[PDB]
Amino acid sequence: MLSPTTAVDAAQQAIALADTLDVLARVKTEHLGDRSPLALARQALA
RNA sequence: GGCCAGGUAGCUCAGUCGGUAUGAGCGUCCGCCUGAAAAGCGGAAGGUCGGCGGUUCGAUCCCGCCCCUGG
Numbered sequence: 647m648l649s650p651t652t653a654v655d656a657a658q659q660a661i662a663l664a665d666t667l668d669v670l671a672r673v674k675t676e677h678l679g680d681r682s683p684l685a686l687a688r689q690a691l692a
Numbered sequence: 693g694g695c696c697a698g699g700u701a702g703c704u705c706a707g708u709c710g711g712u713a714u715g716a717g718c719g720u721c722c723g724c725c726u727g728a729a730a731a732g733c734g735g736a737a738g739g740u741c742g743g744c745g746g747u748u749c750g751a752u753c754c755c756g757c758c759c760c761u762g763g
C-alpha cells in the first residue's frame with residue numbers, strides 16, 4: 647500500500663475545509679503526525 | 693578558553709549509530725461514574741529530541757561550528 651497519492655489529496659482537502667485554528671490542529675492530527683496514514687507509510691519504509 | 697558528561701513532552705527523567713521516541717511517571721482532555729468531584733477502568737491530545745549548517749529518497753542517531761550546566 648505505497649503506490650499512489652490519495653493520502654495527500656485527503657490531507658489537502660481537509661486542510662482546505664478547516665474553518666478555525668482548532669479544526670486545523672485536529673486536521674494536523676488526522677492527516678499528519680504519528681498516527682496519520684501518511685506517516686504510517688513512512689513507518690512502513692522499514 | 694581547554695577538556696568533557698549532558699540539553700529529549702507541561703514537570704522529573706529513561707531510551708535510540710537512518711523510515712515507531714510503541715517513551716515512562718506525574719501534568720492536560722474525553723467517556724463510564726458523581727448532585728458536582730476524585731480515585732478506578734477505558735480512550736485520546738501534546739515533542740520542530742539544544743541552535744545553525746553538512747550527507748542521503750529520508751537524520752534526535754554520522755560530520756563541522758556554536759549557544760549553557762556539571763566541568
Ligand SMILES: [Mg+2]
Pocket residue numbers: none
Ligand atoms: Mg476524568
